[PDB]
Design a protein around this ligand. Structure first.
Ligand SMILES: [Cl-]
Ligand SMILES: [Mg+2]
Ligand SMILES: [Mg+2]
Ligand SMILES: [Mg+2]
Ligand SMILES: [Mg+2]
Lengths: 204, 243, 250, 241, 228, 231, 244, 196, 195
């Protein structure tokens, strides 16, 4: 009945030293029924990464919408959109549906190509921006993620240390949520290289 | 040239020839007048009897707006009716919102802005009427005259139509000979005379006289038609003066 | 009533000319000279304040206008047409960009929006083209400093330096001899003042010349402190005194 | 030659309908003048009542737009009242939306923008009027802003409009060339009105009675027009020195 | 499920201007989403706006009016007035009959002087020398009612404002973390004092949770293509 | 000449040529006569056929139980205007339980015709109408012109050669106004009136159309052998 | 009323021609020449800027060659402002298609859409047509490399080599003379520049008067790359082909 | 809320408390409920604060535009504009407004516009939640053609009792006096009126 | 409507759909074909609210047939499934949403691969080796999870499908009157007339 917990799933993003990480589980379900273990929730437009939790039809729709918009942006601007700018575009787009919203919990992650500064941001379903320095969480196990991140996180982690931190945050949060899990992906993002890692986890 | 073929076009003079041509239709119409008296206004009009078959006293020309304003016009009669219909809508919406009956200067601008609006576009034709109107409000009596251009002013006496020059001269005598003012009953008599005198420009056919008035003492500030004995008295006074 | 002119008033003649656009350009040609020069660390735009009467206060008439904190505009041609275009340009910078991306548009894209408005007056029903050419100077993070010309047709071109209006042919020749890719902003202002003097008949001073720059960020003009990333507008209109100071070193 | 009938460009880049609207401006054969004091803005205009049947109290080309703003018009009365009604509506709306009184220069700009539209849109004709707005603005002080059929507007130290504007303008120019200040250095508005009337008399070379003039005065927080008797008191003071 | 944060927001008038302050906790239900958000916003250079209620509505409404205020300032060639922002905000909010859950304290300076207003989601406005909003408004107002006086100095008003915010921080569960302050004095630039007080610093953890490298089991690695 | 291209253009002498040309269509139309007494009002209309195989174009239209008209000019325009009258008569009865006064009906027709004379795109109506009725103030006869001018009369005629009938009615005025409580004699006067407008042709049984309304007489149209009595 | 001033932009002549379309084509014949040449391993777009100035900022300037998406580009001949209106509409259509089907829009479908928009202005609305002729260079996985042209009538056709703008008669004859089916991109680059060099109304063909682009599968492996040539890169290819 | 308007010999006086509540919390203890729609036409507001402010702002706009065109409006005209807004939008409004004004021709006039959007011209009017407790007192103590000082005392005593019994009313008693002499604001503090 | 199953094997997609149509109290039909051919190599089965199911399916069919004629080209199964998803995603925020769940079984002639897409009435799309809608998956997925192989033949797919239907017939309370089975492969669409 509650649109934000029909399909399940989680996204988490973290900042490190000259790097950002964004991660998500792979589950899509119809309440108790597991439907897909390959439903990735992180997308990218150039060097800007977007994770989206919530109602899966809206996750797909918004990805298609932001691909649409960032493609036109690039043609007109003659450059790739930056994380700060894209964050405002997501916020604007969500608030235009103020009284008929997309039931989602988006998360932006990326590094500004000119300043080199790591950037993350979160949103409620209606466009309110949470621009945290440390970490952003979203999904049906957000409480669990907040608990994991608050204790595990420390600032200025090196890319390969940040990978371990965010992975353990996701995995152990997901294992305490019925509607999350069934696989996981972690993106480690540096100024001009991005590594994607699929994690081994329990499949119940 | 070609500046006179379309409404709202400025000629090289800065003139709107279509409005000036509308005036020609007004000048072609029958004589109508207005006289501002001590506590009100009197309206009178010449009605040409084209044929014996016209039913006497039936084809009424003067029109009431709300209950306190009278309107009379010369030129294209249908255009005048259209303007009065608008005026009645304006007066109704004013009273609806502000409770009080529309003041005469307020009403004058409502007609004025409407007529002026028909000189702004080539998709409409200017009004082929000059309208003499007025009545009594909280500040007293008011008499106005409104032209095809939308131009209007307040008047002591007003005249339009074919015999306007004759009428104006008569009105000017009354203004000079009565600086203190004219009574409502005097104004009715004088109105009858002036229409009879102005009928010399339309001497071919005989006519019917029609008079109305709004007066604070005589009609309680309401517009009423001059009928029966009072009308006959004015006709007699008029007939006596022309002989 | 209703606007019953739903057909184009600008149309192709047998020779392929769009008459109303050509005539709009003729009106621009009669207009007072305005110019723009791009330097390495800034842009300058300038024009003459041709006062219609000495009783008129020409400071109340702004020929050089701020469009965004980092973009400014000047014109040649019909002043009223320019004024309404500035109003539309300011608004479209918000409605079609800042309210979407949370930042001001880059110069080229604002120019593109203004150009689109001018193009539509060339094709839409019951309207004439705008009788102005615009010179738009601006800065943004990824494109740096830039200068654009926009014509009545809606066509726009980027310039290193140019002039429009009355004495544009002579002024452009003057600019060709002086311009190089190593000019500092003060050098461009100096050249602007030299160029503009040739097309001006009467008085030539800070009260008869309007001049603005796109240069360094002005934190003193921001109006507030506390946010490190906000450093103030790059558009700055030179004062009457600031112009006169540079007219002594002329 | 339909480029002369509607507001489209001629081959010379001209708008003839705008130029002919400027000519309609002088159809009333009335001259107006505006000047600024220290605390006030004064506007005077000729008043001609050529018909004895007219009620002279209703013959006016000065309008009270808002409490603070006054407007004199040079041109035919129908277009004048059209502009007056619109200016009143715009000023009232402004106060409702933005919570403060519409400034004189802002109203002028707004009416100038509306005029500009008539010069670009074919279905609307220009109004054959020149509008001179006056006030004592709470930020800018005494203000004179004038609008014309081209959609042009600008602030003035002083200004004149009508068939004999040039004579009045030069007269005013010569005075401000002497004084070297942007206003009439006078405390009371009464004396600023006296200055205005005196310099119109000098420029036009005609004497005025109380019924030959029309006067509007703007002070802080109100604009008002003078009665015939107020003007008479002014004329007496002028004659007595 | 939209953000509605707990907050303590206050506004205090003084000698030559006005000051506003706020806490820095953003809540999601009982969960603290952001431990250092910025609740003080700009409408114009010298007009600032503290917001509470539905977080998305406060930000959105402050930015929209701020945008229209900038265009209005450019159109009129005048610095924007607080009453303009007030009138535009309340007419917007009233049109939506409270469905835009924005509750604001507006404060600033302009040519007319210094001003302090509050706006409620349904479109009502109030005037005052001292005001408070948010879940910690009662805690803050208790302090304001105890210590406020007429003719406050700049330094006194900052002290009173931050003391009112602190009352909310400690006693209201919706409010916490730091104290932001913005001072708007007449004839001067407005000074935003981000994290003016930081009395809630996280203590050193008893243990480091840095994992040995290789702890997490991995199924697949792959290089992602971000370039064209 | 240069000023007759549309209804929105005055001539230099202040004339509206499109309206005048619409008036000309009435003059080409077949003659119809209207006259009344104090108890009854009568319409008489000479119907026109296309040829000997064709029917005779109907001229008289009923608008209500107490009101109707006859037409001369463009028949489709009469259908539009008579339909409008039917609606207005009907609105008055339904909303106010009130029979529409004939004079008010004339005012409504005037205003409807006027709007077509002051706007671009439209055209004036090309038909003249003679409206008869019996209301709370007795019998009435109206003449409608598509200029908008509506006139209340004792008697009149419109169409080709209508001047002959109009002169006759002007002579007979004092006689026919007194024909009270005698429908047949009032119709006789109308049939004699319309006869003053005939040339070459005479009134036959499918040529003549008569209508009557009065004190205790609903608006009824007589055609065919019902008018043989009056031939 | 208003009818008096109506030019009637959408009427046939007695000969059955559309006046405004014909006159718009006359306008386009004075625009700078644009040339498209299709090869087996890619497409070349070459176009001449109109009598330029030394003060024109060339490296940031674009009047001829525009990107519609990653696979499709256009060369413009006519009113640049009119072209940009249509270009933005085309860019939106491409994205609409991509959102709907999750596949890049086939070249012809985009071309047909833009051409239908042009057609509408010749049949209804009473507005003047767009004074623009496009050369569309594009790639999709159905037909591979494709060249199209459209003009103000809304009519479009496919080509192996084509020119629009000024001196098309001379240009088309030269292309028809030297074009062969087994031609390669590097050969097509040379043909395009040689054709412009001969047909130009200027005294000599230099880098500052040209815009140049290639669509190649010279993108590493099974994909397509668009290359809008920089001023220095146009200068180099002019030296390479032996024109300067 | 406790509001009233009373006509007297020299014109009319409007009175009001200053308490604005959200449930049992006093959101504003120094509210100004006496609002100016024209120079000498004021009103007292009760009901939804958002609604009555919105209505008052619209009326002020209407009377400002009226004045520019037709000169000073009557109090009846102002009441009519209020009524038009309240009646036509009765489904979406909770507003109880007392309109008070001074003309030179009509002198002091009071109109009350209750919830339904009807109008009632009265010698004096009371409204708001606190008014219920003073119907008895006001009816017994009101006289026509009182002096300024008597009317101030009548309003002060009346609103004192309304405040005493009504929890939704309190703070200061504000008053606005409308006469030919001009517009005078008065304020009375708790220590003054509580001992009455 | 009730049970609709799909399974993608090595070289084909197999769709199984129940034959029963029940209007409350009575089973009105026991031979209903809950499927539409969208293009020669694309088949769509459907289940949901009465009336809306067929109305939606035929509306989609008409649109794909229109595209096929306009372009003289068959859209890929992926492209068709995306078009269908958008229509359902559009529909869910309409005045009255289509209450329709679909399976799209297609053979991509370009890639030479079978493809099965599962889309619910919200516009929730997933590409799967096997899928279902409603309660069908609850009974059948444990069997499919166990036996499914990506290299299965069409005959093995049909045998695994029979086991699924047998489990449905055993444990489901409703009598769905058997299933109509259709196969989509490189040669197009055909119906298994004995099942
Ligand atoms: Cl404007
Ligand atoms: Mg789990
Ligand atoms: Mg499980
Ligand atoms: Mg025009
Ligand atoms: Mg109490």
């Amino acid at each position: 009945s509650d649109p934000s917990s029909i399909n399940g799933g989680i996204v988490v993003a973290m900042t490190g030293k000259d790097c950002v990480a964004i991660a998500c589980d792979l589950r899509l379900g119809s309440q108790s029924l597991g439907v897909s273990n390959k439903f990735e929730k992180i997308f990218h437009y150039g060097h800007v990464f977007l994770g989206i939790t919530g109602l899966a039809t809206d996750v797909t729709t918004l990805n298609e919408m932001f691909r649409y918009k960032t493609n036109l942006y690039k043609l007109k601007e003659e450059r790739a959109i930056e994380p700060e700018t894209f964050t405002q575009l997501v916020s604007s787009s969500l608030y235009e549906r103020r009284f008929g919203p997309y039931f989602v919990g988006p998360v932006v992650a990326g590094i500004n190509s000119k300043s080199g500064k790591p950037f993350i941001a979160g949103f409620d379903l209606i466009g309110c921006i949470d621009e945290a320095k440390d970490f952003i969480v979203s999904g049906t196990a957000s409480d669990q993620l907040f608990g994991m991140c608050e204790s595990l996180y420390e600032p200025n982690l090196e890319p390969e240390d940040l990978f371990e931190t965010i992975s353990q945050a996701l995995l152990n949060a997901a294992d305490r949520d019925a509607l999350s899990g069934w696989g996981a992906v972690v993106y480690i993002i540096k100024k001009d290289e991005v590594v994607k890692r699929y994690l081994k986890m329990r499949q119940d | 040239t070609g500046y006179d073929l379309s409404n709202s076009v400025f000629s090289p003079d800065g003139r709107n020839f279509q409005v000036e041509y509308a005036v020609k239709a007004v000048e072609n119409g029958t004589t109508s007048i207005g006289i501002k008296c001590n506590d009100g206004v009197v309206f009178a009009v010449e009605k040409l009897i084209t044929s014996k078959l016209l039913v006497p006293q039936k084809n009424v020309k003067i029109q009431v707006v709300d209950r306190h304003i009278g309107c009379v016009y010369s030129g294209l009669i249908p255009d005048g009716r259209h303007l009065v219909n608008r005026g009645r809508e304006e007066a109704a919406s004013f009273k609806k919102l502000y409770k009080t009956p529309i003041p005469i200067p307020a009403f004058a601008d409502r007609l004025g802005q409407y007529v002026q609006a028909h000189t702004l576009y080539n998709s409409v034709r200017p009004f082929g009427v000059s309208t003499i109107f007025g009545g009594v409000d909280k500040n007293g009596a008011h008499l106005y005259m409104l032209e095809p251009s939308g131009s209007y002013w307040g008047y002591k006496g007003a005249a339009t139509g074919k015999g306007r020059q004759s009428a104006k001269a008569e009105l000017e005598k009354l203004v000079d000979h009565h600086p203190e003012g004219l009574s409502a009953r005097e104004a009715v008599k004088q109105a009858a005379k002036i229409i009879y005198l102005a009928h010399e420009d339309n001497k071919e056919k005989d006519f019917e006289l029609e008079i109305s008035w709004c007066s604070l003492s005589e009609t309680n500030g309401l517009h009423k038609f001059v009928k029966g004995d009072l009308l006959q008295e004015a006709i007699d006074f008029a007939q006596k003066e022309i002989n | 009533m209703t606007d019953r002119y739903s057909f184009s008033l600008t149309t192709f003649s047998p020779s392929g000319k769009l008459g109303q656009i050509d005539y709009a350009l003729t009106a621009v040609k009669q207009g007072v000279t305005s110019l723009g020069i791009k330097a390495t660390n800034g842009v300058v735009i300038a024009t003459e304040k041709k006062s219609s009467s000495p009783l008129a206060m020409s400071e109340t008439l702004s020929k050089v206008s701020l469009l965004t904190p980092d973009i400014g505009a000047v014109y040649s041609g019909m002043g009223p047409d320019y004024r309404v275009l500035v109003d539309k340009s300011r608004k479209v910078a918000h409605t079609s960009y800042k309210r979407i991306y949370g930042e001001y548009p880059p110069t080229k894209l604002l120019v593109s929006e203004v150009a689109k408005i001018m193009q539509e007056a060339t094709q839409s029903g019951g309207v004439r083209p705008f009788g102005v050419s615009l010179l738009i100077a601006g800065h943004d993070e990824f494109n740096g400093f830039s200068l654009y010309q926009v014509d009545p047709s809606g066509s726009y071109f980027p310039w290193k330096a140019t002039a429009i209006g009355k004495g544009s042919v002579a002024a452009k020749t003057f600019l060709e001899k002086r311009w190089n890719d190593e000019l500092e902003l003060e050098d461009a202002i100096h050249i602007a003042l030299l160029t503009l003097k040739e097309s001006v008949e009467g008085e030539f001073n800070g009260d008869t010349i309007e001049l603005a720059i796109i240069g360094d960020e002005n934190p003193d003009l921001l109006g507030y402190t506390g946010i490190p990333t906000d450093k103030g507008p790059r558009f700055r209109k030179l004062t009457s005194q600031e112009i006169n100071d540079r007219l002594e070193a002329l | 030659g339909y480029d002369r009938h509607i507001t489209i460009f001629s081959p010379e880049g001209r708008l003839y309908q705008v130029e002919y609207a400027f000519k309609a401006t002088n159809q009333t054969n009335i001259n107006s003048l505006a000047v600024r004091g220290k605390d006030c803005t004064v506007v005077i205009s000729q008043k001609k009542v050529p018909d004895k049947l007219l009620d002279p109290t209703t013959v006016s080309y000065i309008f009270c737009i808002s409490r603070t703003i006054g407007m004199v018009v040079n041109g035919p009365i129908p277009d004048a009242r059209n502009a007056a009604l619109r200016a009143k509506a715009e000023a009232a709306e402004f106060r409702y939306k933005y919570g403060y009184d519409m400034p004189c220069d802002v109203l002028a700009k707004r009416m100038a923008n509306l005029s500009q539209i008539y010069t670009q849109r074919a279905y609307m004709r220009p109004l054959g009027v020149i509008l001179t707005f006056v006030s004592v603005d709470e930020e800018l002080g005494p203000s004179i802003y004038k609008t014309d059929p081209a959609g042009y507007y600008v602030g003035y130290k002083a200004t004149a409009t009508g068939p004999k504007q040039q004579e009045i303008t030069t007269n005013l120019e010569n005075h401000f060339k002497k004084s070297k200040i942007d206003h009439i250095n006078e405390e009371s508005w009464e004396k600023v009105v006296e200055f205005a009337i005196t310099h119109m008399i000098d420029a036009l070379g005609t004497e005025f009675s109380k019924n030959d003039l029309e006067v509007g005065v703007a002070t802080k927080d109100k604009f008002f027009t003078l009665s015939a008797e107020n003007i008479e008191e002014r004329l007496v003071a002028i004659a007595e020195q | 499920k939209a953000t509605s944060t707990g907050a303590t927001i206050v506004g205090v008038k003084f000698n030559n201007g006005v000051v506003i302050a706020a806490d820095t906790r953003s809540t999601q239900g009982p969960i603290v989403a952001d431990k250092n958000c910025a609740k003080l916003h700009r409408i114009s250079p010298k007009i600032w706006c503290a917001g509470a209620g539905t977080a998305a509505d406060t930000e959105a409404v402050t930015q929209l009016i701020g945008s229209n205020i900038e265009l209005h300032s450019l159109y009129t060639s005048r610095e924007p007035r607080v009453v303009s922002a007030l009138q535009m905000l309340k007419q917007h909010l009233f049109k939506y009959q409270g469905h835009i859950g924005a509750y604001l304290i507006v404060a600033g300076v302009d040519p007319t002087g210094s001003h302090l207003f509050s706006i409620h989601a349904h479109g009502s406005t109030d005037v005052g020398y001292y005001l408070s909003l948010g879940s910690g408004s009662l805690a803050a107002m208790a302090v304001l009612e105890s210590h406020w006086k007429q003719d406050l100095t700049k330094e006194e008003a900052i002290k009173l404002a931050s003391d009112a915010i602190q009352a909310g921080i400690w006693n209201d569960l919706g409010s916490g973390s730091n104290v932001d302050v913005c001072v708007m004095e007449i004839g001067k630039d407005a000074e935003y004092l981000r994290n003016y007080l930081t009395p809630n610093v996280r203590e050193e953890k008893q243990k480091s949770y840095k994992f040995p490298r290789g702890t997490t089991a991995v199924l697949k690695e792959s290089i992602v293509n971000i370039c064209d | 000449n240069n000023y007759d291209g549309d209804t929105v253009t005055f001539s230099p002498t202040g004339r509206l040529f499109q309206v005048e040309y619409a008036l000309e269509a009435i003059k080409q139309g077949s003659v119809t006569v209207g006259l009344r007494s104090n108890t009854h009002a009568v319409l008489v209309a000479l119907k026109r056929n296309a040829d000997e195989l064709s029917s005779y174009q109907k001229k008289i239209i009923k608008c209500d139980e107490h009101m109707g008209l006859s037409l001369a000019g463009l028949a489709p325009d009469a259908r539009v205007l008579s339909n409008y009258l039917r609606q207005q008569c009907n609105y008055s009865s339904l909303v106010f339980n009130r029979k529409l006064a004939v004079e008010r009906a004339g005012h409504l027709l005037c205003d409807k015709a006027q709007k077509n004379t002051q706007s671009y795109g439209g055209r004036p109506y090309g038909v003249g109408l003679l409206i008869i009725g019996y209301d709370k103030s007795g019998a009435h006869l109206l003449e409608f012109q598509p200029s908008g001018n509506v006139t209340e009369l004792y008697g009149t005629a419109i169409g080709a050669r209508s001047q002959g009938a109009k002169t006759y009615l002007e002579r007979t005025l004092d006689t026919f106004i007194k024909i009270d409580g005698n429908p047949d004699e009032l119709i006789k006067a109308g049939v004699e009136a319309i006869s003053q407008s005939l040339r070459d042709e005479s009134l036959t049984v499918d040529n003549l159309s008569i209508a009557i309304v009065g004190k205790d007489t609903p608006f009824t149209i007589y055609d065919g052998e019902a008018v043989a009595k009056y031939i | 009323g208003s009818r008096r001033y109506d030019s009637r932009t959408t009427i046939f002549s007695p000969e059955g021609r559309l006046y405004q379309v014909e006159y718009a084509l006359e306008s386009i014949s004075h625009a700078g020449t644009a040339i498209g040449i299709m090869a087996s391993d890619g497409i070349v777009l070459a176009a001449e800027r109109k009598v330029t100035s030394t003060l024109l900022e060339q490296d940031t300037s674009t009047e001829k060659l525009y990107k519609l998406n990653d696979k499709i580009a256009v060369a413009v001949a006519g009113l640049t402002a009119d072209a940009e209106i249509l270009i933005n509409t085309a860019r939106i259509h491409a994205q609409n298609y991509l959102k709907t089907y999750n596949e890049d829009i086939p070249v012809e479908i985009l071309v047909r859409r833009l051409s239908d928009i042009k057609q509408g202005y010749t049949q209804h609305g009473g507005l003047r047509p767009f004074g623009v002729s496009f050369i569309y260079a594009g790639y999709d996985d159905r037909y591979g490399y494709q060249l199209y042209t459209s003009n103000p009538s809304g009519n479009y056709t496919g080509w192996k080599a084509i020119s629009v703008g000024a001196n098309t008669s001379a240009a088309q004859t030269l292309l028809q003379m030297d074009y062969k089916d087994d031609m390669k991109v590097d050969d097509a680059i040379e043909l395009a520049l040689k054709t412009l060099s001969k047909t130009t109304d200027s005294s000599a063909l230099t880098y500052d008067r040209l815009e140049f682009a290639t669509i190649r599968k010279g993108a590493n492996d099974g994909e397509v790359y668009q290359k809008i040539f920089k001023p220095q890169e146009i200068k180099d290819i002019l030296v390479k082909t032996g024109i300067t | 809320t406790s509001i009233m308007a009373v006509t007297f010999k020299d014109g009319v006086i409007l009175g009001a408390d200053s308490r604005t509540t959200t449930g049992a919390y006093i959101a504003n203890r120094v509210t100004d409920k006496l609002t100016r729609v024209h120079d000498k036409i004021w009103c007292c507001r009760s009901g939804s604060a958002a609604d009555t402010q919105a209505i008052a702002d619209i009326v002020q706009y209407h009377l400002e535009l009226y004045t520019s065109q037709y000169g000073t409006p009557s109090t009846e005209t102002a009441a009519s504009v209020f009524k038009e807004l309240c009646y036509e939008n009765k489904d979406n409004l909770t507003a109880g407004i007392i309109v008070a004004g001074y003309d030179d021709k009509n002198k002091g006039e009071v109109y009350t516009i209750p919830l339904g959007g009807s109008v009632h011209k009265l010698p004096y009017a009371i409204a708001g939640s606190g008014s219920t407790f003073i119907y008895g007192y006001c009816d017994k103590n009101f006289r026509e053609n009182m002096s300024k000082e008597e009317t101030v005392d009548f309003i002060k005593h009346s609103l004192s009792q309304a405040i005493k019994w009504d929890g939704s009313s309190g703070g200061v008693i504000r008053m606005v006096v409308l006469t030919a002499a001009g517009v005078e604001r008065l304020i009375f503090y708790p220590d003054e009126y509580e001992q009455l | 409507m009730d049970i609709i199953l799909g399974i993608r094997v090595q070289d084909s997609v197999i769709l199984a759909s129940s034959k029963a149509v029940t209007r409350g109290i009575s089973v009105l039909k026991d031979s209903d074909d809950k499927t539409r051919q969208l293009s020669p190599h694309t088949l769509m089965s459907f289940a949901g609210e009465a009336g809306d199911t067929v109305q939606f399916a035929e509306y989609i069919q008409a649109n794909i047939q229109l595209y096929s004629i306009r372009e003289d080209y068959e859209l890929s199964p992926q492209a068709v499934s995306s078009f269908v998803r958008q229509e359902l995603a559009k529909s869910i925020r309409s005045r009255r949403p289509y209450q329709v769940n679909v399976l799209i079984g297609g053979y991509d002639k370009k890639k030479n691969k079978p493809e099965l897409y599962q889309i619910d009435y919200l516009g929730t799309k997933v590409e799967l080796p096997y899928g279902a809608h409603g309660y069908s998956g609850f009974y059948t997925f444990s069997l499919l999870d166990h036996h499914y192989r990506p290299d299965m033949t069409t005959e093995e797919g049909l045998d695994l499908l029979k086991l699924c239907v047998q489990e449905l017939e055993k444990r489901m309370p409703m009598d769905f009157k058997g299933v109509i089975v259709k196969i989509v492969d490189k040669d197009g669409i055909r119906q298994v007339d004995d099942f």
